[PDB]
Design an enzyme around this catalytic site. Structure first.
Site, PDB file in Angstrom:
ATOM      1  N   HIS A  64       0.818  -1.203   0.000  1.00 48.83           N
ATOM      2  CA  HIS A  64       0.000   0.000   0.000  1.00 48.83           C
ATOM      3  C   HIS A  64       0.855   1.257   0.000  1.00 48.83           C
ATOM      4  O   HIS A  64       1.994   1.220   0.444  1.00 48.83           O
ATOM      5  CB  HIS A  64      -1.027   0.001   1.113  1.00 48.83           C
ATOM      6  CG  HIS A  64      -0.463   0.228   2.467  1.00 48.83           C
ATOM      7  ND1 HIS A  64      -0.247  -0.771   3.388  1.00 48.83           N
ATOM      8  CD2 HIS A  64      -0.173   1.380   3.112  1.00 48.83           C
ATOM      9  CE1 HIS A  64       0.128  -0.189   4.512  1.00 48.83           C
ATOM     10  NE2 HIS A  64       0.184   1.115   4.380  1.00 48.83           N
ATOM     11  N   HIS A 112       1.596   3.999   1.639  1.00 49.11           N
ATOM     12  CA  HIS A 112       2.020   4.848   2.747  1.00 49.11           C
ATOM     13  C   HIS A 112       3.549   4.699   2.892  1.00 49.11           C
ATOM     14  O   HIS A 112       4.102   3.640   2.584  1.00 49.11           O
ATOM     15  CB  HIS A 112       1.362   4.408   4.053  1.00 49.11           C
ATOM     16  CG  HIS A 112       0.011   5.013   4.315  1.00 49.11           C
ATOM     17  ND1 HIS A 112      -0.765   4.592   5.365  1.00 49.11           N
ATOM     18  CD2 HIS A 112      -0.615   6.047   3.686  1.00 49.11           C
ATOM     19  CE1 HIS A 112      -1.832   5.367   5.356  1.00 49.11           C
ATOM     20  NE2 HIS A 112      -1.795   6.263   4.371  1.00 49.11           N
ATOM     21  N   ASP A 158       5.910   3.859   5.181  1.00 52.10           N
ATOM     22  CA  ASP A 158       6.527   2.632   5.683  1.00 52.10           C
ATOM     23  C   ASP A 158       6.651   1.521   4.660  1.00 52.10           C
ATOM     24  O   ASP A 158       7.431   0.600   4.853  1.00 52.10           O
ATOM     25  CB  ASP A 158       5.795   2.104   6.945  1.00 52.10           C
ATOM     26  CG  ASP A 158       4.346   1.673   6.678  1.00 52.10           C
ATOM     27  OD1 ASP A 158       3.655   2.309   5.856  1.00 52.10           O
ATOM     28  OD2 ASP A 158       3.897   0.692   7.316  1.00 52.10           O
ATOM     29  N   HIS A 203      -7.481  -0.831   6.182  1.00 54.03           N
ATOM     30  CA  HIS A 203      -6.547   0.110   6.791  1.00 54.03           C
ATOM     31  C   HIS A 203      -6.309   1.279   5.857  1.00 54.03           C
ATOM     32  O   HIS A 203      -6.103   2.421   6.270  1.00 54.03           O
ATOM     33  CB  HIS A 203      -5.234  -0.594   7.110  1.00 54.03           C
ATOM     34  CG  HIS A 203      -4.110   0.336   7.374  1.00 54.03           C
ATOM     35  ND1 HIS A 203      -3.934   1.036   8.551  1.00 54.03           N
ATOM     36  CD2 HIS A 203      -3.105   0.744   6.554  1.00 54.03           C
ATOM     37  CE1 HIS A 203      -2.885   1.831   8.414  1.00 54.03           C
ATOM     38  NE2 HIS A 203      -2.357   1.680   7.218  1.00 54.03           N
ATOM     39  N   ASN A 242      -3.231   4.144  12.884  1.00 50.87           N
ATOM     40  CA  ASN A 242      -3.521   5.345  12.108  1.00 50.87           C
ATOM     41  C   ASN A 242      -4.710   5.040  11.207  1.00 50.87           C
ATOM     42  O   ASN A 242      -4.643   4.267  10.254  1.00 50.87           O
ATOM     43  CB  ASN A 242      -2.308   5.721  11.207  1.00 50.87           C
ATOM     44  CG  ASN A 242      -2.568   6.974  10.395  1.00 50.87           C
ATOM     45  OD1 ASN A 242      -2.936   8.021  10.938  1.00 50.87           O
ATOM     46  ND2 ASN A 242      -2.404   6.874   9.094  1.00 50.87           N
TER      47      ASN A 242
END
Ligand SMILES: [Zn+2]
Length: 213
Positions: free
Chosen positions: A72, A74, A76, A135, A166
């Site tokens: 995904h 993001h 990280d 998420h 988050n």
């Protein structure tokens, strides 16, 4: 086995042979020892950590990282896309992930995966699956047919996870259906690797369903 760099640790613990886990400071990922090179599930926070991990891995395995699968858009997971990019490493992602990386000012991954994608790296057979929003709008799971190992990403939370984390970009309502989707597609799951925390089994999928209500 368990091997680490030095401070701001990077560590490779071992699941079966050929399948190791990479975690950096915690964020998890996979390192697939394949006949055709090393394949990584997710890079890391940033270029430094992704540069260091790639280097530690090619050294131990005497093989080149050839492909990386991003679960995904993001940081990280997509932090080292510049490194992968300059180095000639193939960054796989769904089209959404790619357009989301773009939207957030990152090098665009391949946008090559579709809802269900069966990849093959030498002996390794890898299945990517977009279960739905959870998420994050684009989160996908990685399944290794030959080991019943599931990399659940951040869609799945570890035992020590007492909150969803988050949820800024989350779809809490779709999230349970998405996990239900994984459970229906993957009966008999040996190990489940979370986006953060300890590796466990199917119980982890159930723990998260609990954090949703
Ligand atoms: Zn995330």
């Amino acid at each position: 086995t368990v091997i680490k760099n030095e401070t701001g640790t990077i560590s490779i613990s071992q699941l079966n042979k050929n399948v190791w886990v990479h975690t950096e400071l915690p964020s998890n990922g996979l390192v697939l020892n394949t006949s055709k090179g090393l394949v990584l599930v997710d890079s890391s926070w940033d270029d430094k950590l992704t540069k260091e991990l790639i280097e530690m891995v090619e050294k131990k395995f005497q093989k080149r990282v050839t492909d990386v699968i991003i679960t995904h858009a993001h940081a990280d997971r997509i932090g080292g896309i510049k490194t992968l990019k300059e180095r000639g490493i193939k960054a796989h992602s769904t089209a959404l992930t790619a357009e989301l990386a773009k939207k957030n000012g990152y090098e665009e991954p391949l946008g090559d995966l579709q809802t269900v994608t069966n990849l093959k790296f030498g002996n390794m057979k890898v299945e990517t699956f977009y279960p739905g929003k959870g998420h994050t709008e684009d989160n996908i799971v990685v399944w290794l047919p030959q080991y019943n190992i599931l990399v659940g990403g951040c869609l799945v939370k570890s035992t020590s996870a007492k909150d969803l984390g988050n949820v800024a970009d989350a779809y809490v309502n779709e999230w349970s259906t998405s996990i239900e989707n994984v459970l229906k597609r993957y009966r008999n799951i040996n190990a489940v690797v979370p986006g953060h925390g300890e590796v466990g089994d199917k119980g982890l999928l159930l723990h998260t369903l609990d954090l949703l209500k």
